[PDB]
Design a protein around this motif. Structure first.
Motif, PDB file in Angstrom:
ATOM      1  N   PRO A 195       0.828  -1.237   0.000  1.00 55.23           N
ATOM      2  CA  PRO A 195       0.000   0.000   0.000  1.00 55.23           C
ATOM      3  C   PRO A 195       0.840   1.255   0.000  1.00 55.23           C
ATOM      4  O   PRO A 195       0.295   2.348  -0.070  1.00 55.23           O
ATOM      5  N   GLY A 226       0.040   7.950   1.593  1.00 52.15           N
ATOM      6  CA  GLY A 226       0.172   6.526   1.308  1.00 52.15           C
ATOM      7  C   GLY A 226       0.575   6.262  -0.126  1.00 52.15           C
ATOM      8  O   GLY A 226       0.034   5.330  -0.753  1.00 52.15           O
ATOM      9  N   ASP A 265       0.174   4.513  -5.993  1.00 48.29           N
ATOM     10  CA  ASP A 265      -0.670   4.322  -4.805  1.00 48.29           C
ATOM     11  C   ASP A 265      -0.332   2.985  -4.132  1.00 48.29           C
ATOM     12  O   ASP A 265      -0.202   2.899  -2.901  1.00 48.29           O
TER      13      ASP A 265
HETATM   14 CA   LIG Z   1      -1.690   3.693  -0.969  1.00 44.29          CA
END
Ligand SMILES: [Ca+2]
Length: 213
Positions: free
Chosen positions: A8, A44, A206
């Motif tokens: 992530p 993130g 991402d």
């Molecule tokens: Ca992410």
């Protein structure tokens, strides 16, 4: 090889990935990879930067997996940089530097037109499998999911879960490292457009997923 994983990109995992640093690929890659040009955002994301520390010199970011990966589904949720003369990428790669044949599978976004994506691959150093696909949106604008399913007898490429391209001839066979980079070209104006020195520019990732065959 490595097993299935999901990252992530909430933080930089240094046992799992490594940053190119302190050298230029040479030829068309008119930049020096710098560790500082790979960074993690507070949202993130992994961000790759094209920056200029001095007149006509460019720093860029390339990140690679420590492990090597074989047959299966590779997915990246990303948005490329937008500018003449550059590329943002997500690819697999092994070659002579690794004691193997040059086997590679590419998703590349030519910055001169981020409403298209280019697919390609090399098998034992033989390439020229370029396929350019209209996306129907501008990749630079928002995250999308891009993927390739690398099988023994075929590679299948997807955009947001939709099949876009299939290759069946001279398919790669040697596991490779998962890589992403962003760079400005020279000597490849016809392909990328010339680069005009504009900076800083960023490509954002991402998340990355791999699922073994
Ligand atoms: Ca992410």
């Amino acid at each position: 090889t490595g097993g299935s994983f999901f990252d992530p990109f909430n933080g930089y995992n240094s046992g799992f990935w490594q940053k190119a640093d302190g050298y230029s690929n040479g030829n068309m890659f008119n930049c020096t990879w710098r560790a500082n040009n790979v960074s993690m955002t507070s949202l993130g994301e992994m961000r790759l930067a094209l920056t200029s520390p001095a007149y006509n010199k460019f720093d860029c970011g390339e990140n690679r997996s420590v492990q090597t990966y074989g047959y299966g589904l590779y997915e990246v949720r990303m948005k490329p940089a937008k500018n003449t003369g550059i590329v943002s990428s997500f690819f697999t790669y092994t070659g002579p530097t690794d004691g193997t044949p040059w086997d590679e599978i590419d998703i590349e976004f030519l910055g001169k037109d981020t409403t298209k994506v280019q697919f390609n691959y090399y098998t034992n150093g033989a390439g020229n499998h370029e396929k350019i696909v209209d996306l129907g949106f501008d990749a630079a604008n928002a995250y999308h999911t891009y993927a390739f399913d690398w099988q023994p007898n075929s590679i299948k490429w997807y955009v947001d879960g939709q099949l876009k391209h299939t290759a069946t001839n001279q398919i790669p066979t040697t596991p490779g490292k998962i890589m992403m980079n962003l760079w400005n070209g020279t000597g490849v104006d016809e392909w990328l457009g010339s680069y005009n020195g504009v900076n800083p520019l960023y490509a954002h990732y991402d998340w990355v997923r791999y699922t073994k065959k």
